[PDB]
Design a protein around this nucleic acid. Structure first.
Lengths: 113, 95, 160, 78, 99, 105, 78, 99, 105, 95, 160
DNA sequence: CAGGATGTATATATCTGACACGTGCCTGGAGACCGCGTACGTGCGTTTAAGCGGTGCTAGAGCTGTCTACGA
DNA sequence: TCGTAGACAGCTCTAGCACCGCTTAAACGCACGTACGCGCGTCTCCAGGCACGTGTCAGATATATACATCCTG
DNA sequence: CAGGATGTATATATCTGACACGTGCCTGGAGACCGCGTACGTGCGTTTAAGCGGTGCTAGAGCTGTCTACGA
DNA sequence: TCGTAGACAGCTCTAGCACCGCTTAAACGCACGTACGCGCGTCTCCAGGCACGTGTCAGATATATACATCCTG
């Protein structure tokens, strides 16, 4: 509620291996706080897959883990962060399907179709 | 007004996939075209010569990658060597 | 833990020991027919870092030079230790008398300590690691390396 | 051994070939690492150039053309 | 006092001598080892023309001749007459082989 | 059907098949040659871009400056070579000062 | 004057750009001779490259393509 | 004793500062002179694109950035902190611009 | 009629017109292009040769060694450049020793 | 036995004009072919590209010399530039 | 003779004069309101080499440094001579008292001697050549160059 | 301050093999369209192995004819 | 569609690899000491070009001069 | 041993223009065939001119259609 | 022979050159002193791509905080 976000576990990759906070942590069994990602306090969460996808107070659809189904290689993406969307009120994640809706009454969904 | 076939659009498009917001500069959005320039170039000649010093009057993938490996640096090469492999397999598997 | 995580933890313990210069669980004692010898005051497990072969670092003849003057005076014992630190003879001349214990360790071909190169950001560091479980009271020993015919003729204990 | 192969009276030889007035102690095997390095850089692209025509026996001109690409085009054989 | 030449004159001639010859100054059989060695890490189970073989020496032999040459300034320009380790390295950066 | 659609890389691999022919690289040039090259080119365009993308976010807000772009290429040891004979404009140095230059007491 | 053009608070500027800790006295105009030199080497082949297409107005890409041939291919404009 | 910074700290920041900016550090109008100057000895009565013009600066501006950079080692490696004349030259040979 | 006969340079300027075409330098290549090139090539072959010819006489008797040939190319400041990125085999150094290397008393 | 079209003969012939007795080596008489190789090569590409960056699909003397000047060093260039001029004028003045 | 042959003969005479250090046809004399002045003892023709501005050679501030200590002691006269020797300020500080005569030559904008750079295999050499036919007994003078507002304010003879 | 021990510049007999020129051949080119101190040099004895060739075995480069899938 | 380069099984034979005792050049080891580091487009005709063979003079060779050069009592 | 004078990291209001996306268009792409000492740094006053734009003049790059000599 | 690239006169209009007073950043000059140098293939169909136009959010901007950092009594 204060603003900071806790953490635990470790996501299973598309190739199929272990990663927690990019390359500074692999398996996070001990539950620890996650550092500053977006100044506005993160409202709700959005589980499913290895694809955790928070939502800022401003409405900045943030995103950690893989989200494979934006795109990259050689790690360095797990630990971040944004981006996409505009001012989404509901961030509603399934396994390999994402769901979003802009405060301007919009209905979006960007994943493995 | 002769049509300047610039990688601008294409250079922009591939930005989106890697990063959605945003984001470039004018000076740099030229700098990109001169990363596409030097590669397309340097690649073609270790492709071209390859054909001459392996006696075949037509540049296949056979060469293009061989250069690609021979031209790209260590880990990067195997990567794009992989990404070619991919775009090689997908090109063959089309309708 | 993985092989990389254990090597990083083993390197971080070795780097802290080289920095502090701690020579715990070791004391000087007069060995019979060897001058000074290093003996263990506590049990050292197999693979545990014993002590750094500490002295003055320098190049190839940059240690084999005080050699040509230390031959001019026989009293000062042979305390030079040459080594190939990344293609170039890099050593640690411990001829000068100091409180460090690595220079006083005796010779044995089947001892209880092995000499290895331990790099720390470019600077080479000769370290002595326990080859087997060293018992308390027993003398710390390591293979000196010089098995040559000229050296073995002058002091015959190098052979055994 | 291989790197021991480039032996003192040859590094030196090679070094007196540029008027080296005196080789220092460490300097010697540094040449082995370098000559390794240089060897390394080269043989690799070269073999890689043998590969792109499927030769199990590596050509001299392969060495050469690769010795070119690197940046020190040698003359004579080719 | 038997016959002797003061330290430097000899190797100074070594310059005269080694600067004269077109004689590849590091043993062939030895390099073929180093030659075949770095083969393995490239491609296991290979052959190479004895001709080719020479060149490989030739170049790196030559390469070294000038990189030791260039290296001479590296300590000439450091208030030094004798070429130590760093001296060799310094040159690598001004070439940009490393840096 | 677009070949780039087929093979699945963005940067038009019909312009690669057509730049190649009249670029005078050789007499003939197979269909895949443009393709594998296109994908060689884009796996570069991409691997490049994101280095900036992560860096440009880091320093600036959203949009890459030139001295962002090269602020990346200096730092990736692999590219650092690739773009080691080049001179990306407006770059300036990824900073460094010698150990015998900073303060001492 | 031209060579006076490359003026002290710019050589310096350009030199602090590589962490130059202190420029010595002579060192300064040496940069002018060099920057002359470099200017010289370049403009020449470049103009020569304008010549081989008959342009009285020298192109930027001429500068560039010549800035390539020399050996320090610049990126951006081209 | 008014406020002052001990000799070195200031220009050390000059590094911090000048090592930060993408700002072409030698005046444009000035170079256009030097630019047009070396024109004459090439081809009398010429014009050039203002665009092109920049690059010419750009490169030689850049060229100089690294050749002063490389030059830093040249005196770093000579028991020196301050870069004198020879230092500049030494680098030219290890590049092979002259030698 | 041989074109080299016509133009008057030795090194076959029909092989220049025929190396050019199937060398894939470009699509088309004018008659003179081989010629002026041939003569570019031979004014080099010649300007080169004689430097050895004078040098090889000087050291040896008649026939040029390799370390004669390059014993020339080092010394001609013009060529010294031309062949400044090359490595003529069996050469060895046109000797030099630093001023702070020779004797001193 | 595939025919190795080597400059050997031609390389020999031009020796005679400059110097009659003699005179070469085997190692060097290869070295000559690799002076003819690197030039014929380096020359063709500042010729080739010239055509591309001056938009003409055929390599005339127009380019060949322009490169020749642009490629040869200072005094040498004007010399061979002269010798071309010559072989240019003689080629035109034939029967 | 050609223009090149006369320049080579003029350079060989100047190189021999700089090597020998001969200052013939010149003697010191006390000028009225100028301290020491150089006067001719024999007739010097137009273009003839008079004498080298001899002293201690060094870089830009490598002469303008004893400046910041020679301002700390006013008695030692201003004897520094700066110059641009091939893009780099190369000078000849003649502050120390020696038997050389070039450092004692007085200032005059319309004198009878001009200062020129004479290179001899890389090493710069300031030489004084006769601008016109110098009469016997007359004072040797040359344009000092410093026409600045700070220097002209402290000694007004620099203007004329 | 200088003559004698090292070893380099020089001279000339003498055998060896690669430079050089003749020849049948075949395909590509032509024609018409300052000072403490130690590191490294110099020189001679011990010792490792490079260089030598003699040569049998055969991997594999190189060339050819045929069928056919690639790319303009 | 279709001309044809490329795949490819098939085959001649150059040339790379392992062998292996032996004269000895050279790498190696070591003692003494002083200079020196260091800190203070296409069909046709045909001769130019190359592979092949063969004789010998340029040059490698070696005993043997004379020579320039470096160094301590 | 430490608190106060420099100036750098940082925060946020606010206008500006280049990044970015829509559109008619047209051609290229697709498909089928240690120590003496001086040199250089730091900081403030005097002074040169770079940077600014406002803008008229027109050189000359760029494009087009036609005739014809070049080279496959 | 003959398809056609290249020569070339002709023409639109971008863009390079000279102008020129002015706020002021910056180059310049100089005094004090201490860290530091230095010695000791082809015809056809058509939509992908580019030039053009237009709206605004990324970022340059600037007053304004707070901040890390360097230095003498």
């Amino acid at each position: 509620s204060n603003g900071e976000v806790y953490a635990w576990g470790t996501f299973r990759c598309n190739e199929g291996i272990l990663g927690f906070y990019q390359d500074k942590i692999k398996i996070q069994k001990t539950p620890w706080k996650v550092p500053t990602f977006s100044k506005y306090n993160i409202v709700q969460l959005a589980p499913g897959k290895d694809h955790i996808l928070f939502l800022d107070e401003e409405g900045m659809v943030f995103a950690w883990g893989n989200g494979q189904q934006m795109e990259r290689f050689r790690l360095k993406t797990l630990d971040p962060r944004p981006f996409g969307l505009r001012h989404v009120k509901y961030i509603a994640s399934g396994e390999n399907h994402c769901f979003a809706l802009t405060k301007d009454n919009k209905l979006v969904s960007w994943g493995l179709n | 007004k002769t049509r300047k076939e610039s990688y601008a659009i294409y250079v922009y498009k591939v930005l989106k996939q890697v990063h959605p917001d945003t984001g470039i500069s004018s000076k740099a959005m030229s700098i990109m075209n001169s990363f596409v320039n030097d590669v397309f170039e340097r690649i073609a000649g270790e492709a071209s010569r390859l054909a001459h010093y392996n006696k075949r009057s037509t540049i296949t993938s056979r060469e293009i990658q061989t250069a690609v490996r021979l031209l790209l640096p260590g880990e990067l090469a195997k990567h794009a060597v992989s990404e070619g492999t991919k775009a090689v397999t997908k090109y063959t598997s089309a309708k | 833990k993985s092989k990389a995580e254990l090597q990083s933890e083993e390197r971080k313990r070795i780097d802290e020991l080289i920095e502090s210069g701690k020579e715990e669980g070791m004391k000087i004692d007069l060995i019979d027919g060897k001058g000074r010898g290093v003996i263990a005051t506590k049990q050292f497990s197999r693979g545990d870092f014993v002590v750094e072969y500490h002295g003055d670092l320098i190049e190839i003849t940059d240690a084999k030079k005080r050699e040509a003057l230390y031959a001019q005076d026989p009293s000062t014992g042979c305390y030079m230790y040459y080594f190939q630190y990344l293609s170039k003879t890099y050593c640690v001349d411990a001829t000068r008398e100091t409180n460090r214990l690595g220079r006083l360790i005796n010779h044995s071909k089947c001892g209880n300590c092995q000499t290895k190169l331990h790099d720390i950001d470019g600077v080479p560091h000769l370290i002595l690691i326990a080859s087997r479980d060293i018992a308390a009271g027993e003398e710390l020993l390591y293979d000196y390396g010089d098995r040559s015919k000229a050296s073995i003729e002058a002091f015959p204990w190098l052979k055994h | 051994d291989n790197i021991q192969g480039i032996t003192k009276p040859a590094i030196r030889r090679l070094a007196r070939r540029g008027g080296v007035k005196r080789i220092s102690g460490l300097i010697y095997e540094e040449t082995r690492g370098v000559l390794k390095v240089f060897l390394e850089n080269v043989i690799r692209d070269a073999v890689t150039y043998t590969e792109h025509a499927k030769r199990k026996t590596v050509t001299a001109m392969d060495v050469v053309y690769a010795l070119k690409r690197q940046g020190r085009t040698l003359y004579g054989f080719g | 006092k038997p016959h002797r030449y003061r330290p430097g004159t000899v190797a100074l001639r070594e310059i005269r001598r080694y600067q004269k010859s077109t004689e590849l100054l590091i043993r062939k059989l030895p390099f073929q080892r180093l030659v075949r060695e770095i083969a393995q890490d490239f491609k296991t189970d290979l052959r190479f023309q004895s001709s080719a073989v020479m060149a490989l020496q030739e170049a790196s032999e030559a390469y070294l001749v000038a990189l030791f040459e260039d290296t001479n300034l590296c300590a000439i320009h450091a208030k030094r007459v004798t070429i130590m380790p760093k001296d060799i390295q310094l040159a690598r950066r001004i070439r940009g082989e490393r840096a | 059907k677009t070949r780039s659609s087929r093979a699945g890389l963005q940067f038009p691999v019909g312009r690669v098949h057509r730049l190649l022919r009249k670029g005078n690289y050789a007499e003939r040039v197979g269909a895949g040659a443009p393709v594998y090259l296109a994908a060689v080119l884009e796996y570069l365009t991409a691997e490049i871009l994101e280095l900036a993308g992560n860096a440009a976010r880091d320093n600036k807000k959203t949009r890459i400056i030139p001295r962002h772009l090269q602020l990346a290429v200096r730092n990736d040891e692999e590219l650092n070579k690739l773009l080691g004979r080049v001179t990306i404009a407006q770059g300036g140095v990824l900073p460094n000062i010698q150990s015998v230059l900073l303060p001492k007491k």
